[PDB]
From Swiss-Prot, chains A, B, C, D, E, F:
CDD domains, per the entry: pyrophosphatase
PANTHER family hit by this protein: INORGANIC PYROPHOSPHATASE
Physiological role: Catalyzes the hydrolysis of inorganic pyrophosphate (PPi) forming two phosphate ions. Antigen that activates dendritic cells (DCs), increasing their expression of cell surface molecules and augmenting their production of TNF-alpha, IL-1beta, IL-6, IL-23 and IL-12p70. Rv3628 mediates these effects by binding to TLR2 and activating downstream MyD88-, MAPK- and NF-kappaB-dependent signaling pathways. Rv3628-stimulated DCs induce the expansion of OVA-specific CD4+ and CD8+ T cells which secrete IFN-gamma and IL-2, and the generation of effector/memory T cells. Thus, Rv3628 polarizes DCs toward a Th1 immune response and promotes protective immunity against M.tuberculosis infection.
Native source species: Mycobacterium tuberculosis (strain ATCC 25618 / H37Rv)
Residues bound to Mg(2+) 1: D53, D58, D90
Active site (record annotation): D90
HAMAP family: Inorganic_PPase
Protein name in the entry: Inorganic pyrophosphatase
Top class in the EC scheme: hydrolase
Gene Ontology biological process terms in this record: phosphate-containing compound metabolic process
Binding positions for Mg(2+) 3 per the UniProt entry: D85, D90
Length: 160, 160, 160, 160, 160, 160
């Protein structure tokens, strides 16, 4: 069913934390990570969504080769990382590239190897460890179904 | 005589197929090539041209060091790659950087070494070999004169 | 006191000379340097400033990891490189990242090691050596004080 | 059952064709490829084997991140690429990393997606297209079983 | 006083865990880290030392630009990272480049900024978190004096 | 006529100054350059030569893509850079790859564009500018002829 555009803010392997300014469209170097970690996958947000906090819904995209910040990728959801940090709840849709048969075998979170999900989860739990006031409290994984529903709501919030 | 601006969509050496969306201005990861090949030169399109198919005229730009997708380069034509694929005819203007005396010795397609033209041609002939329905039929090289004429028409089509 | 946004045009380590077109917002490959040199730090301009010559005030930003052309970084001044070239006077504010405590020990030009200031100065003195008509005549360093003053003036020129 | 050491000569993504000199141990830049292609996976030879032609048996290793020429990787076979070129028969064992549970799901050639095998095969069929006298005639895939047997013989040839 | 040669096994920024085999001299891809982390500095061992476990003493080397695995760097000690893992005690001498005046200001562990020591410590505490049976228990910092003493013993063990 | 092996110590684009230790065969990080410069071509020495100073004759090799330190390349001379520094005379043979027809049009120093020879010369004249006691006094270009002669002598010194 569902598919959308993700705007990659941060390439796999990067320790610079880029972000897109959501009115001006410009890309911004928010900060350099305080921990010796790097983004586990290409990271961004779903174009035309609105989360709880006036921010578009976050997205992880699985790619063979990282992209550049600002790049659009047409993607589809396979699961969702649920996380509660110091600004409270925050979710990240796990995605593969849409209409690329090389990802056809990846249909739900069951299809992504554990060592990969754990590596991703390990990054978000620890990446802000050396940043005062900043912490993480929940962190877990849910299936394409819950991913799809959270997307749907954020699309509807974006239209209101 | 003629010179124009090229928007590089894809850097030399890249296997990610970026493209510029021509209304929104945004850059897009179209697909990752199915063959183990990589763009033989920096690749883009001539700004303010319109081809037969509502798409700006394609350009190859010879550069010492690859640029980033979206980067403008002022360029001049030295020849043109004529190719007929599954969507029919499609041409690619061969360029060097404008007003850069290091390229002064390159004035027509005679001035580009054969092994380079062949490498470029070999890329377009084979890059879509593992992509169903997609094939290539003609593929040859023509001089700065024919390049200049096709540009001129595409500039005039862009003004209508 | 003072702090501002810098738009990085050229990453540390690059030999391609990118520049932002100031009306269109687009990024441009101006030229590939003629000397075997690479920008000693990330290089751009202070957003919303206007110099003597209708061009925004130049900026050097010290970063742990280079950014991409077009990226915004919030920054604060610690000194200024004064230089007179073939188009006359031209200054470059030395900046560190704003609100990043890892840079708290850098408060004025005294706090940047000499070998670094000399490396930067060596780049601007020599980078145009193989470029006809282009030369450099003055080149020296001044403190956060004078930096702050030149910024203020350029901000005020931008509002007129 | 079987597992061995591979010495990577050429990293995934490289167009430089490095080779190890088999007496001196030194690494050598044989040639830069004439086609705009790059090695589809990390490429080398199985340490302590001897093929038909006094050369150690060739190996492709599947890795998450490319290595450096000269690097040893402990590996296990999953299949074999059979190829007949201008020097006649030549085979390449397809391998994954030994004792790394992240590759446990890859047990025979059935387990490697078609688009990957085809990409590899496409590289070896075309990489020497622009090299006079050099051609390719057979090229196909066989299973872990045949891979294992060819290894065994090359190990025994190495002991004679 | 003391200075020695370090063989860098692993460049800053790498997630591949290279190691030197200490008889054969050859470099080996041990494993790819299970956590989304990357070596916080260039990492290796002190040439001609012998630790408690028949392995040369580990070293961290602070460098402006990462080297290649196998590269020798002449270095001097400024402190030492004391850590107890699953194989028991294991120490890591913190070094700067020898005879390089750019590092003259770094004379003991007091001279290395806290955010750097913490980043390094954070790496060794967490890098093996997703690796069964592997854990970390102590982890702290000591001064150039203790570094110098542990080196001295390992040099003497190497001569017996 | 003449052709030989070059051992590349330093890749084009690098600022780390690698060097091969000539007895042990090991590669060494000598220093990071003090100026914001990077080696204009791949740089090494002619294998089995001996200069005036017990050091093998230096070599520049022109390549499409840089190699790794320690890599051998079979090469042929097209000219020589003569230079006198603080340790007196020091020469560097300009080479292209042997038996590669893509370089057949480069037969003597006349065949290398001026902007290239000047770039190379500019690097050796300035790269040590910020290094106390270190300077450069002569620096010029001579033809394949003189190159061939200096090689011959160094080969003969190597055999004595």
């Amino acid at each position: 069913g569902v598919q959308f555009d993700v705007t990659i803010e941060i390439p796999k392997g990067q320790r610079n934390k880029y972000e897109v300014d959501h009115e001006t469209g410009r890309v911004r170097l928010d900060r350099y990570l305080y921990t010796p970690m790097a983004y586990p996958t290409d990271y961004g947000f779903i174009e035309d969504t609105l989360g709880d906090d006036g921010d578009p819904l976050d997205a992880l995209v699985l790619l063979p080769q990282p992209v550049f910040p600002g790049v659009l990728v047409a993607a589809r959801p396979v699961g969702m990382f649920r996380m509660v940090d110091e600004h409270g709840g925050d979710d990240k849709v796990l995605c593969v590239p849409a209409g690329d048969p090389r990802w056809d075998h990846v249909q739900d979170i069951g299809d992504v190897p554990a060592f990969e999900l754990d590596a991703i989860k390990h990054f978000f739990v620890h990446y802000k460890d050396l940043e005062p006031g900043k912490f993480v409290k929940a962190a877990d994984w849910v299936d394409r179904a819950e991913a799809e529903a959270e997307v749907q709501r954020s699309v509807e919030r974006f239209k209101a």
